[PDB]
Design a protein around this ligand. Structure first.
Ligand SMILES: N=C(N)NC(=N)NCc1ccc(S(N)(=O)=O)cc1
Ligand SMILES: [Zn+2]
Length: 258
């Protein structure tokens, strides 16, 4: 009876195994655009993904992760609110059963169809596992997805999903360029938060881009053909794998723009 996104094991239950679920800096949050504070101390984001080395794509029963070689500074995030270098380890998405829901963060209470999370860890901590134990261990770049025109840089991801339909399946996924998932603008909001899944550790500097990317209906429909279940188990579509907005508490979200 492990955590997930059903009625019996979903977000409202997580606190029983992970009491930090009711902590002081949980994610995601609603971003009130009028109450976000423009912060002139914030720097432009530096996204350096030209040397990224994707390796594999995995259905882990919650989402699918596209994994990167994070043994060197090949794909790094710097600048913005950050004071170190953060290596890309994986990206994944959260999405809905319908286009009207799926994002984790919200903007003036609006839900997007999905949200991309590019997960990076602060190199001074040596490994991801050590970084998640630190208040500045991770930087997650969040990008909203809306349904409209196709995202050509997503299609390579979409097309491999049939090979990792069920929990525990992986497929080699080399030479994927994550630059093809970015919007035009790197304007962002930032705040201190948490992992949005168990163990819900309060280790993340969130950087949420203002400008969404557009994906096609057909692209997101392929996400919704994935399964939470393993092969040879009853089919449960992998949909609505998002945590809803959590209390802001003693935080003000900062804007890089205005
Ligand atoms: N490196 C990993 N595979 N990360 C992992 N253990 N899962 C940990 C993890 C990483 C990121 C997020 S999120 N949704 O806050 O971006 C949740 C959980
Ligand atoms: Zn995520």
């Amino acid at each position: 009876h492990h955590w997930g996104y059903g009625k019996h094991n979903g977000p409202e239950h997580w606190h029983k195994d992970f009491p930090i679920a009711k902590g002081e800096r949980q994610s995601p949050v609603d971003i009130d655009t009028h109450t976000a504070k423009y912060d002139p101390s914030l720097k432009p984001l530096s996204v350096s993904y030209d040397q990224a080395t994707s390796l594999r794509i995995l259905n882990n029963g919650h989402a699918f992760n596209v994994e990167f070689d994070d043994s060197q500074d090949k794909a790094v995030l710097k600048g913005g609110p950050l004071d170190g270098t953060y290596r890309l380890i994986q990206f994944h998405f959260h999405w809905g059963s319908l286009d009207g829901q799926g994002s984790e963060h919200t903007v003036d209470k609006k839900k997007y169809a999905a949200e991309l999370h590019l997960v990076h860890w602060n190199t001074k901590y040596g490994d991801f596992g050590k970084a998640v134990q630190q208040p500045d261990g991770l930087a997650v770049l969040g990008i909203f997805l809306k349904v409209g025109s196709a995202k050509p840089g997503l299609q390579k991801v979409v097309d491999v999903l049939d090979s990792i339909k069920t929990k525990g399946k992986s497929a080699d996924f080399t030479n994927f360029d994550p630059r093809g998932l970015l919007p035009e603008s790197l304007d962002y909001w930032t705040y201190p938060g948490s992992l949005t899944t168990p163990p819900l550790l309060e280790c993340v500097t969130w950087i949420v881009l203002k400008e969404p990317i557009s994906v096609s209906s057909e692209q997101v429909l392929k996400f919704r053909k994935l399964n939470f279940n393993g092969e040879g188990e009853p089919e449960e579509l992998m949909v609505d794998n998002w945590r809803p907005a959590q209390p802001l508490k003693n935080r003000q979200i900062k804007a890089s723009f205005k």
